Symmetry: C5
Amino acid sequence: MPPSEFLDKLMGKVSGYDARIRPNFKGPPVNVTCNIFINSFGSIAETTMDYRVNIFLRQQWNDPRLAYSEYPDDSLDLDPSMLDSIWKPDLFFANEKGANFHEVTTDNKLLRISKNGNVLYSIRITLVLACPMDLKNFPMDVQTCIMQLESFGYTMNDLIFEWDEKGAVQVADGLTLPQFILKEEKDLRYCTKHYNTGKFTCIEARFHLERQMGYYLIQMYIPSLLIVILSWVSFWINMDAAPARVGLGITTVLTMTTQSSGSRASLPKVSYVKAIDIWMAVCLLFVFSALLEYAAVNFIARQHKELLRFKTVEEMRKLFISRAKRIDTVSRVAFPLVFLIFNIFYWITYKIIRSEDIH
Amino acid sequence: MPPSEFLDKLMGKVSGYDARIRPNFKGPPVNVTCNIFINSFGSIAETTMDYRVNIFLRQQWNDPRLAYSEYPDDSLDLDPSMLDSIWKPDLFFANEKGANFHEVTTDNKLLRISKNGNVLYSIRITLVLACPMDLKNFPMDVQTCIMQLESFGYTMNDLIFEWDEKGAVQVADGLTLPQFILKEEKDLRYCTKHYNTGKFTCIEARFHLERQMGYYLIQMYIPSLLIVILSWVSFWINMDAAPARVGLGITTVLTMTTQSSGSRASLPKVSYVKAIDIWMAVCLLFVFSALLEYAAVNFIARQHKELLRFKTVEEMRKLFISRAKRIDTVSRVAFPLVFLIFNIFYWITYKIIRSEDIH
Amino acid sequence: MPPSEFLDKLMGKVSGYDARIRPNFKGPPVNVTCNIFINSFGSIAETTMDYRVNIFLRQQWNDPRLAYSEYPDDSLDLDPSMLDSIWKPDLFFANEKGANFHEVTTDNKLLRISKNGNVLYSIRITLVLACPMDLKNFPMDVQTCIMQLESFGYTMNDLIFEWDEKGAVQVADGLTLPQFILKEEKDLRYCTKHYNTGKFTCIEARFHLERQMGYYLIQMYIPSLLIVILSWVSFWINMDAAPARVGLGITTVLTMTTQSSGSRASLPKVSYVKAIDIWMAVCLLFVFSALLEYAAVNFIARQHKELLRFKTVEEMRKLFISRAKRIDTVSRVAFPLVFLIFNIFYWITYKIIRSEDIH
Amino acid sequence: MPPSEFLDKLMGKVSGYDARIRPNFKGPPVNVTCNIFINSFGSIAETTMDYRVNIFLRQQWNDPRLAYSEYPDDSLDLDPSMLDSIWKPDLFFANEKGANFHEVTTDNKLLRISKNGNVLYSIRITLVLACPMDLKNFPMDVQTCIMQLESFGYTMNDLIFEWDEKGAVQVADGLTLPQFILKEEKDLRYCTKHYNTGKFTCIEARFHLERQMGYYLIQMYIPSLLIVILSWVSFWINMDAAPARVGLGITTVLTMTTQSSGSRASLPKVSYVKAIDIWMAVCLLFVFSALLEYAAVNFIARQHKELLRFKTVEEMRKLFISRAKRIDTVSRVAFPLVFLIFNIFYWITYKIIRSEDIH
Amino acid sequence: MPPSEFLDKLMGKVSGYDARIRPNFKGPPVNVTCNIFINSFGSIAETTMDYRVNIFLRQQWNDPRLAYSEYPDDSLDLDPSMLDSIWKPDLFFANEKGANFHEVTTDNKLLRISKNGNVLYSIRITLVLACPMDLKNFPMDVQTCIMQLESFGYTMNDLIFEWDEKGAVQVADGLTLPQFILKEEKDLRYCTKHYNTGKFTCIEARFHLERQMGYYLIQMYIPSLLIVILSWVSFWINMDAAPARVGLGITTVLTMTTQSSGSRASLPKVSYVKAIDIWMAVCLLFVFSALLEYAAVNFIARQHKELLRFKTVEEMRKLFISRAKRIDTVSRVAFPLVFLIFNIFYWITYKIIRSEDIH
Ligand SMILES: CCCCCc1cc(O)c2c(c1)OC(C)(C)[C@@H]1CCC(C)=C[C@@H]21
Ligand SMILES: CCCCCc1cc(O)c2c(c1)OC(C)(C)[C@@H]1CCC(C)=C[C@@H]21
Ligand SMILES: CCCCCc1cc(O)c2c(c1)OC(C)(C)[C@@H]1CCC(C)=C[C@@H]21
Ligand SMILES: CCCCCc1cc(O)c2c(c1)OC(C)(C)[C@@H]1CCC(C)=C[C@@H]21
Ligand SMILES: CCCCCc1cc(O)c2c(c1)OC(C)(C)[C@@H]1CCC(C)=C[C@@H]21
Ligand SMILES: *[C@@H]1O[C@H](CO)[C@@H](O)[C@H](O)[C@H]1NC(C)=O
Ligand SMILES: *[C@@H]1O[C@H](CO)[C@@H](O)[C@H](O)[C@H]1NC(C)=O
Ligand SMILES: *[C@@H]1O[C@H](CO)[C@@H](O)[C@H](O)[C@H]1NC(C)=O
Ligand SMILES: *[C@@H]1O[C@H](CO)[C@@H](O)[C@H](O)[C@H]1NC(C)=O
Ligand SMILES: *[C@@H]1O[C@H](CO)[C@@H](O)[C@H](O)[C@H]1NC(C)=O
């Protein structure tokens, strides 16, 4: 038998196969199993609130026509150039921007057909998909991103989309993300769509992402702790009669505010307050407080000198000097201890909220 | 009856149905009801003066042809591949940039036809639409964005566009915007278009947006208030013989001007003066004023020392020192009180103008 | 009469109408009147040296064929789907980048035909057009932007382009630009094109733009004047024995140079010197001069002390101190007066050059 | 013989050549040799993690049909306009984004055919290819970038891809990269692909890149070393009673932290710590340490003065002053020596790790 | 004679003209003269290493067919819609990225045909072309940019490309570049291409660009010279007992390093050292040297005071003070003179290297 003659008899002019009619017309809905392979994951960005993904869609359905039973083999690998003369199902993504095809040297496509009529359609597509991430806890967080596949033009009574029982979602070996660690959970559930026009089938796939705390810690946490230590430098040593202490204080407050403004740059604007904001605010409160500590001790010294200029003057000199020294030594010991207790409280509470949230 | 034979008899070669002629030719204008669904709203940006929206256009009209009365059911769900062999109406958007289609695995389209001839056309389109926002009050404002649908090629005597009486505009459940809160008002009115060529139908849809005052307050209002307090630090304590006071003043003025320049960065250039500009200008006036307060007290002290070098000298020492101290204490108490009264006046006036404007 | 039969008899197979031949072949040139409507104007940018415009091109010409005289009405509104079976004229823009079409739900097009044969062609097109703006006077300037329409493939002997006698250029009501004010002058003149291949027709349209001095004044003029006043603060008060005066001077010079560098950021690089550069340079000269004033008075005081250490020493003390005070008071009064006279001279000369230029 | 008659007899309607059937159908797999030429290499960027390349793909295979043996010459240079009427093989790139074609004046294509049936297909394509670079050692590193060619639609039993024995990869003469030096090694190996659908052929090409240490050294290494020397300036000279030393220290720490933040700007965020981070951290530790050295000597001097105010006081004056001077001189000599030993250790260890890694 | 009948007889179905066969088949190579017109030149950018150009390609060749000799005129201006039914030659650009066509209202094309058979093909194309500029001398340099036209699919034995003897390259009148001055030299030479597949014709056009030294001088040279003068301010006046001198020095070094980092921003990273780097490095060396001058004089004064505290002490006071003053006055006179001699040497050497290079 020649291949050309059979190939046109199956889906051509002698065949009454019209490509505009669904199989099992006036009949039970056409069931479709969908298997997705993820070639690459990338560009998870915040301002845009979307990511880039390259998938290998694969959908199988049955047709009562296209049952040959004439060649002795089970399946046939056809050309991808007659994929316009058969009944492809409609499928689109709901949270989709763009999503072009690929045509390098040939259009990337695959066609297979078995003896009973079960077909196999494979398409390569790069999708930009919108993920509405919640930045309640910015440095430490888990983000869930949604992929939705749904039928634009058919109702529930036709083209019901079902998932695949085994190996529904696969991932390429040795696939990594610079910022996030992918979680091998991939829970699958389906939610139908209701509209005024009708009821439309849909299926959903969920991915869990855990952010890496490697970059943020060095970029932000480590410098701020140093600047606090540097602010602490003044108290321990520099004598009361010091012009420089004030300059040191002003510079360390300026650098604190400019660094705090710099940190919240990439992040999109949000009404709620992030964890990094809380940490930076507390740090700014500490440095500012130090410059107030000097302000206090200098005013007490001024009172001491004013009374000294006016023995009776000697009577208050010792007590005022002792009070100033008392303020200094107490500041010295107290400021690190409270920073320490705040730090342990902050870390433990975030370490416990994340543990509860991940479950 | 076979489906193919009926399908070609309705709109094919045996049918005298020419797709270039409007229904009811030489007759009353073809009425068209338009229903819009909003799948996503996003990217409301200022410099570009435009936003991004993904809609589901739906338009229904009647045809005297395409009345079958042969199948026993009421409606038929046709393929979206013969949407080029019928009379689609022309429709374009006036404030439109771009507005591509979507073709993922199939072109997103929907066709329905009833027994009488009422058709249903559904198209998915992402529109970049230009909104001429007015930034009279930058932190607190309400923005109205306009969507216009109008007929390019037909006059009033044909293809009159009407809105839908019930459920004219729907929004997807759980749809949120990071910066703005959408208002569920959506007032609909239509304005016709007059040109030298002719008179053309149009319909308009209006959306109201309220900006969130969560990001701006932390980013700008909170640091400026701190810097003012820091400027105030000098007066209360540092003695008259102080080199540092001047350095503190210069730094706090530098940081004020650089922060003020930084704030007006994203915003597009406009001739009129925004509210944020007024607040920053007043704050800069306050900090600058402080450095003048020192300038005054130092000059008075200089006069005191000059006369002291020239008892007769003692006669003016007490009065000049008392005057310098008087200036200091008065500055101390007066500066916070006036800031407070300015702040309450500013907040109350903006809170009342917004209340009047929203109505 | 049926509409289809007439519609194909006019421009179809029974008609000898070949769409590849110009009307009046071997005859006088085909005259074409061109009317342009401006729907939107936007994105006037400097670095790119181009702007964005959305027009409604309209061109009318006469044909001896397509004269029906069979329907009782004067004109017919045809479909925009047979605009490929007639003789559209060629037209392109010379200073053009991009210039795509618009195809939303239908291609935006319009066809009309009268009894004598006068046709009406309307096309919507967004053009990016290059404007070679001259920044001789950057804050205050008038920019002229050119639109050119010319024939690529025909010589003078054919397809002569003429403007429209009445209402040649119209603008949409309530159309505004954020940065510029459009001038309602729109002078129209045409310049022919000469090439080695031949002589080609062209027509030109000119638009006048006046920049708004609302943003620049607050952004640049107002802060610099403040910083000059702040520089002046040192002279009036701070005594000769001052460490801080020098620090104040250095900071105000640093902030001046960084602000001057910041101002010339958006503007494209040009060889010639802009007005804003002149103003900033003079301001920098003033602040720098002040720090020199201190340098002078401090050196004179040093000479006074050196002689004092070496009565005979008392003999020169009074004269040197008086000279230092003389320098101080004279600096105090002279510096504002010269700034004032420079400012009035600068403003008056620019206000008069603009008045001469606009004419 | 006329050329047209032969040209249509070979691949036209009289020929039974169907372009949908692979040569040697129901037979051994079609072997394909692939030769690649690299016209340009460019845009190696880090954030995107991809590069741009312009290749000249060339693939040869044999066909039993298309064996003419009628013209007296060996080969024929055909038009590139009938490349749609023959059996092109499918080929796509796995780590591919974009990859458009080129159609300037004509589509860039080449067709050749020999007497036996060996064809030659040449295509020009610009590929954006993703390279997962590892930044373990940022200034000094070797990056390997992968190009993969694989068959989308055929299994192992068909269309086996083989490399070319001689001159498999060529490069254009005088081709240079601004940042990297290309290595003339280009090791070629092939890895097959396994999927649930089937087993698919693939071939891989590897390129080695060595970064230039010319820009980084001047941009980052040279300024930091200067700033350390500048920090060292205080110790050698400025006396114990110095207000300025503290200001110098604070400024040199501020500039160090801002420069360190600035350096890690272009680089994409990564969890692991880069070499440049280690160097900057050590440098910041050194400058910060100096400001502590002053803090220590000032506190010792304070103790000396406090006891002096309270002979018995003279008894401890000499020892405390000697201790302060001892601390100063020792700091003077010790700080450069340790910097030197750290620097030599760092350079030698990186120079040896790179030598081991390149092998 | 009717125009349609002749038009189809020349290149239609009755004509044996196959558009897939080159003229003079089995014959001498088809000679082609190429004339290029440059409508616009723009966007010469450094990071991308490419520029944008809009040309009017024009190529003429002879055909033995298409020789009518039936109309009484010499040439005919045909429609640009049958440019697909003739033998256009292949032509592509080797250093090409992108290069789209233009289709505004009509595709921009031109066809002419003479009595003998000489045709004229004109195409408008915007080309992004890669220029490998060498930044050995960054502020003053001459850049040569290459345009290459070559045949993709034919060998030397066919389609030989020749230049035009007269007026090979023309430029539009009044065409200017903001940054560069175009040189009216445009030397033309051709270099053939050798490949393993075969030998392919090519022709090359060279353009010379001279950079304007108007922007760079004001942006970089002028501020640095001012900052050096400002650094010099300290030496002449401020007495030895000065806290401020050190602060002035540190600020002027900080501003120098930040300005130096800022200057090398737009420029792409390169291993070799640019002229601007040399100038900035020398300037930084001068300012840094000044702060060392103070360090020296302060240490000498410290030795003087230390011996004074320990007449015998008076014996060394005069000599140490005289030495300190000697260092001051000598610094005063020497520093400007050496700057002057360096400046004249630098300018003269660059002015002479450019003169040699341009030849
Ligand atoms: C009796 C004299 C004690 C005054 C010295 C004093 C001053 C001071 O600012 C602080 C002190 C103690 O310790 C405590 C009270 C824990 C504060 C925690 C929070 C803040 C911002 C700073 C701490
Ligand atoms: C009798 C000595 C009083 C002079 C001290 C004085 C100085 C001064 O700058 C201010 C004072 C009072 O209070 C008032 C007058 C409310 C001002 C409001 C606006 C500004 C910028 C600052 C305030
Ligand atoms: C007799 C002592 C007078 C020297 C004080 C003196 C210093 C000085 O720098 C200036 C003075 C006067 O007024 C004039 C001369 C108008 C200058 C105009 C331009 C510049 C930059 C500053 C002004
Ligand atoms: C007996 C008095 C000696 C104290 C002076 C002293 C202070 C000091 O900070 C350093 C000294 C010595 O040398 C060594 C110990 C090598 C340190 C290496 C690492 C660091 C950050 C700095 C060095
Ligand atoms: C005898 C005392 C002389 C020392 C004063 C001295 C210090 C000094 O730093 C320089 C002096 C002279 O002149 C020369 C030697 C020309 C140097 C040229 C290059 C540099 C960076 C600065 C210059
Ligand atoms: C799809 O599956 C459902 C549930 O098993 C079944 O009721 C229906 O008939 C199936 N559709 C077919 C066989 O077309
Ligand atoms: C559209 O509605 C108007 C108002 O009801 C009516 O006058 C007109 O005839 C309608 N057009 C039709 C029925 O084609
Ligand atoms: C166009 O107008 C000119 C000037 O009125 C006239 O000479 C010419 O004949 C006209 N072209 C026609 C009528 O085709
Ligand atoms: C391809 O090469 C293999 C190994 O030499 C051979 O077994 C196979 O038959 C070849 N395929 C052909 C000749 O079609
Ligand atoms: C092209 O020119 C060369 C040199 O004059 C000549 O030898 C060749 O025959 C020409 N090609 C033709 C006439 O086809």
